[PDB]
Amino acid sequence: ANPNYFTYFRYGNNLGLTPIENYADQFRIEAGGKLNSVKPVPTATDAKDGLSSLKWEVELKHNPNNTKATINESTGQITITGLKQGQCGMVMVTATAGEGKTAVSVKQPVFFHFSMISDSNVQLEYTPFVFQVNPARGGESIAPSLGAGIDKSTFRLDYRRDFFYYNIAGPDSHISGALAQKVDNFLSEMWNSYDATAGTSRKPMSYFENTTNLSKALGYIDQTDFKVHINPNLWRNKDGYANGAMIGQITYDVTGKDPQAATSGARVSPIFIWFDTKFLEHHHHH
Ligand code: NA
Numbered sequence: 001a002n003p004n005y006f007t008y009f010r011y012g013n014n015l016g017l018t019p020i021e022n023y024a025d026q027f028r029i030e031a032g033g034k035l036n037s038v039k040p041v042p043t044a045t046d047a048k049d050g051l052s053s054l055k056w057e058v059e060l061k062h063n064p065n066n067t068k069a070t071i072n073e074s075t076g077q078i079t080i081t082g083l084k085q086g087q088c089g090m091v092m093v094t095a096t097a098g099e100g101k102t103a104v105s106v107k108q109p110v111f112f113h114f115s116m117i118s119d120s121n122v123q124l125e126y127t128p129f130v131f132q133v134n135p136a137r138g139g140e141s142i143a144p145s146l147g148a149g150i151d152k153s154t155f156r157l158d159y160r161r162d163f164f165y166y167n168i169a170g171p172d173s174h175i176s177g178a179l180a181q182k183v184d185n186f187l188s189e190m191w192n193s194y195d196a197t198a199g200t201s202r203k204p205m206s207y208f209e210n211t212t213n214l215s216k217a218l219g220y221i222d223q224t225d226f227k228v229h230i231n232p233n234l235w236r237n238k239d240g241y242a243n244g245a246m247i248g249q250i251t252y253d254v255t256g257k258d259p260q261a262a263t264s265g266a267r268v269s270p271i272f273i274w275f276d277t278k279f280l281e282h283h284h285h286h
């Protein structure tokens, strides 16, 4: 197209994952580290005038209750504050080339994970921590590392509470925000499609609540490898397929039991699920 026309930028990742275009833009703050040590700058674009010709803007998406983000308008350097240990956060970055009628803007998410050692010496890390999934086809995330000394055979892991969804490029009618009582949004619609009585419960996302019908869950964690599974043909409605990102709190138990009632130190939000029909899996030759 025109002189301002472009289609992408990239920040990459600090996880050693390559090539960077096969993964979301995503940054981990290591266990026991500081948020102010991870201030990513962009590394790629198809803008002809390049990274130092773009106007950089940021909007914090997750977690609105406690996280903030700012951006250097010239360099694109992002700074995050307030994200809590054991949680992921999400921002939307907008880059704009030019001004006026022929200006072109491109918006993309950037994700963050503040890792930690939680109860019982667990250090739960998905690498990548953004699972890019096609909602028509479904799929399974990476298997996480659990931490040194953890018995994987007695580990149990399940979604629990605090589910949030952020529309990225889906229809505006996929309303963003927390799954909550008396709020009609994309997550309440998804929940209700699983069961009219699901409410704000873990049930649509739970292994332990779907043991005899896993294929019916919106998604679940398996108890062998602890991958997150997303089932096909559910994250959609008449207006369109999900095109957006979901985060939920996940609880664990180190004694072979359903972790429903795990206490506060055995609760984390270690993974973001990003739905987009354009995603095809990169299997690395299996
Ligand atoms: Na559904």
Ligand code: NA
Pocket: 161, 162, 163, 164, 247, 248, 249, 269
């Ligand atoms: Na959460």
